[PDB]
Design a protein around this ligand. Structure first.
Ligand SMILES: c1ccc(Nc2nc(OCC3CCCCC3)c3[nH]cnc3n2)cc1
Lengths: 258, 297
């Protein structure tokens, strides 16, 4: 229903700037670290597989965790707790059948009580002032997916996997806006699988070119190369399923030709 | 806390929680209070309240009710809203001796399509237009209300909940189980609502899904592959459907002119890709002379 496509792309681009998190927040986190955030996002992928949640949901959940920690200081035994609450909220916002609070409590191997979950949820709702409709990489990808010639389902799937790896690592991905990670990721997918590049029509819609995307593209490219040694691997595991055409099994390009 | 409001009378129960008319003791504003009973060690803040609150604060428009504030307790959550005089259903039923003049119909249709384009435009689907959710003021304004069933949507959309829209105002894509639905469903409800502002009676008052379908098909014809490519392959499409002929639109809504019939007819296109979008409907020849008369009150 490309009736509102330029209208929605245009609004999404304005809200990624307002829904974006502080790039330097981990320097001001007295007790948690990128790696500690890397472990939590991994866990969340896994919870995602476990209840069969949308990938969009894992992506909003992350957006909430980053914006919550952008201004709330958190001890490392509480980081999961922020992570379960953001995850109930994202589920409560996007899923047809949200997992129930029991299930959030159960998958923390009763690290937290139900009452604690439920007070953090509430507390995430006020740090975030109830603004849960953030734009995500996945919202930008799906719009970029409409531009393939013809649709290539390995391409979609590998873009999904890479945009998804961008979630795990706060350094370098918190410097980049969602539209831009999806850019890099859609380019990296098309190139690997088909040899083609960021098409002319997406330049026209997005205003992004290979020159705009390179900074993100170089980074995403080293992430693709090191994927197999990353301490975190649930994204790799997941992308082995049939459902995403086992694209975590494809070989990343040797070079990029930029 | 709720210190400054003076509760004045309840208004009713919509999709979730309860609504009261109130007054700001200090400023004098008349607000609509939507009181959501919290309940910890249950599920916590309902998703209906999380979608609405977050989507309504993005939607600020003359024809979308305005959510003025959110008083966030630990037991209760209150949504503070711009208050309105009545709903369309309640007005319609009051104007049923001498109906709604055309100018007021047009203007309301025009004003709803504006609010409805603004929602679609900001990736929001209302999913529950019906006269009870459309509030009117004493100035002629008409506004979309109750965002309890609304939803942020994606481009191309995904499958969303199926249990959606009040039966009578529900679209044929929904009744036959299409895995993907969109914005075309809000327009379909406005189509029914437009027809109702005119005839002063619901267009398709079914009593069940099958009843709904067959009432739609007795009016517009049983859809086929010609009028709607893909219909006969749909999940709840049945080969045995009675094959009904399409009644000529002037008999569907007798009082309407040619522009009005053309416009209602684009709103009710079976095929969701051909249904007119809200934006486009704003430039229909139906509205050349749209004005804003202030209804009787
Ligand atoms: C009659 C008298 C008064 C009203 N006023 C009014 N009501 C609301 O929710 C009313 C709900 C109540 C249950 C059915 C659907 C509509 C509002 N939300 C923001 N402003 C509102 N104003 C409306 C009708």
């Amino acid at each position: 229903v490309p009736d509102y496509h330029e209208d929605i792309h245009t609004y999404l681009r304005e809200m990624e700037v307002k829904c974006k998190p502080k790039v330097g927040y981990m320097k001001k986190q007295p007790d948690i670290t990128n790696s500690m955030r890397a472990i939590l996002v991994d866990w969340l992928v896994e919870v995602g597989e476990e209840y069969k949640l949308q990938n969009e949901t894992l992506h909003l959940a992350v957006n909430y965790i980053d914006r919550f920690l952008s201004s709330m200081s958190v001890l490392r035994g509480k980081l999961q707790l922020v992570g379960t609450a953001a995850m109930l909220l994202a589920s409560k916002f996007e899923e047809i059948y949200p997992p129930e609070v029991a299930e959030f409590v159960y998958i923390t191997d009763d690290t937290y009580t139900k009452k604690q979950v439920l007070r953090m949820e509430h507390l995430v709702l006020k740090v975030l002032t109830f603004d849960l409709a953030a734009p995500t990489v996945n919202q930008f990808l799906t719009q970029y997916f409409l531009h393939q010639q013809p649709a290539n389902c390995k391409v979609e799937s590998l873009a999904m996997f890479l945009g998804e790896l961008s979630l795990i690592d706060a350094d370098p991905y918190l410097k980049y806006l969602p539209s831009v990670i999806a850019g890099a990721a859609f380019h990296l997918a098309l190139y690997t699988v088909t040899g083609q590049s960021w098409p002319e029509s997406l330049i026209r819609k997005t205003g992004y070119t290979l020159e705009s995307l390179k900074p993100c593209l170089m980074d995403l490219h080293q992430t693709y190369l090191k994927a197999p040694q990353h301490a975190q691997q649930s994204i790799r595991e997941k992308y082995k399923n049939s459902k995403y055409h086992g694209v975590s099994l494809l070989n990343p390009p040797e070079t990029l030709n930029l | 806390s709720m210190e400054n409001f003076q509760k004045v009378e309840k208004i009713g129960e919509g999709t979730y929680g309860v609504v009261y008319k109130a007054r700001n003791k200090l400023t004098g504003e008349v607000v609509a209070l939507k009181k959501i009973r919290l309940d910890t060690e249950t599920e916590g803040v309902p998703s209906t309240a999380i979608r609405e609150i977050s989507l309504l604060k993005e939607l600020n428009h003359p024809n979308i009710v305005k959510l003025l504030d959110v008083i966030h307790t630990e037991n209760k959550l209150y949504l503070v809203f711009e208050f309105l005089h009545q709903d369309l259903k309640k007005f319609m039923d009051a104007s049923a001796l001498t109906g709604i003049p055309l100018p007021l119909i047009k203007s309301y249709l025009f004003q709803l399509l504006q609010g409805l384009a603004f929602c679609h435009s900001h990736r929001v689907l209302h999913r529950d237009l019906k006269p009870q959710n459309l509030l009117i003021n004493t100035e002629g304004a008409i506004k979309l209300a109750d965002f309890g069933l609304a939803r942020a949507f994606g481009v191309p959309v995904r499958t969303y909940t199926h249990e959606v829209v009040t039966l009578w105002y529900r679209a044929p894509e929904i009744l036959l189980g299409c895995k993907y639905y969109s914005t075309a469903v809000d327009i379909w409800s406005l189509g029914c609502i437009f027809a109702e502002m005119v005839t002063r009676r619901a267009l398709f008052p079914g009593d069940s899904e099958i009843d709904q379908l067959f009432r739609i098909f007795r009016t517009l014809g049983t859809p086929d592959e010609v009028v709607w490519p893909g219909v006969t392959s749909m999940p709840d499409y049945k080969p045995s459907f009675p094959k009904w002929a399409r009644q000529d639109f002037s008999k569907v809504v007798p009082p309407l002119d040619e522009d009005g019939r053309s416009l209602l007819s684009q709103m009710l296109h079976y095929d969701p890709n051909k249904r007119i979008s809200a934006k486009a409907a704003l430039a229909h020849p139906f509205f050349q002379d749209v004005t804003k008369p202030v209804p009787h009150l």
